[PDB]
Amino acid sequence: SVKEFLAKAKEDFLKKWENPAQNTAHLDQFERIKTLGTGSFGRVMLVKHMETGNHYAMKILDKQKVVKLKQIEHTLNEKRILQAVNFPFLTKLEFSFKDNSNLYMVMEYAPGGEMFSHLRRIGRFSEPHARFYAAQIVLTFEYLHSLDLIYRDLKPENLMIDQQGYIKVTDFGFAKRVKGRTWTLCGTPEYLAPEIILSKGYNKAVDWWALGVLIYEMAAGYPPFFADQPIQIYEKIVSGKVRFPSHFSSDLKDLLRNLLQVDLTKRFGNLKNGVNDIKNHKWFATTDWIAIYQRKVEAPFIPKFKGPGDTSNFDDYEEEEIRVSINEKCGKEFSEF
């Protein structure tokens, strides 16, 4: 069954969770090529592994910047979780290591670019296009949640398209293994559940709310709650009140009313029947879940490649040195990394 598959998945995950891989490469083993994305204390570069000629995405965090942002424990979470998972829509760690200045995490490279880029350019996705992506998010959450993992940063910016037009759910800076309830204020304003905004304890159900926002944004081309400033966005989120575009099909609207549900006792994903309330919703009726997992389904859009290590589906960022101090920084803070 699904249950059987997940039981084994847990066994695989827990072994790595309890005994994390550590120090499995060195910077000098990679040739850096291009910055693919940037972050607060971090950035991701395309690199080439010299021994194999394989291309990877290398996330580089500045240890001092992590400490100033109070993201030490969150960073340890990201690395510990990503070295332990394995799922077709996740990019597990191939390698990690650290040096005097930086932390490094090396993962599968998705050459298709961010969903964000294509969604913004094209404007919106058709319902079948939106559903193709949603399905993979549904499956990924089912996997993560069964591992007691909450993801906490669903948005198109983090959804990477691969060469076959399938999705990688990336950036686990806020992902956490937690049984029961947690309190940290984190995520992205447009995608925050009202629980988070109202500083309640919360759980995995916030990932299912964020799914509602995503599917809305994919199908409309804009989010259900937007404004110029985060406060105004939080006002809209807690108000209740979601307006749907006229072109939203009947089934879509119903699915979204059930994901974007402020009442936790009624929010899909969170009920007695779990993920199956979503999986068996009429909007997903044409979804062959096994075939999505297996990647047998034909992608509704497939990225325009013209080489391996081609980066035309990414924006251009200024290229910053990767500097390495002669002194070790923050050694204690990151001892287990």
């Binding site: 942002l69 800076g173 984190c186 992205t188 447009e190 925050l192 081309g221 804009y222 937007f226 575009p245």
Partner: peptide, 20 residues
């Protein structure tokens, strides 16, 4: 239109995480 209001907004580009 809501589309036009979105496109005119300051939040059509990449959106940063919040943290405290």
């Amino acid at each position: 239109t809501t589309y036009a209001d979105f496109i005119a907004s300051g939040r059509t580009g990449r959106r940063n995480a919040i943290h405290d």
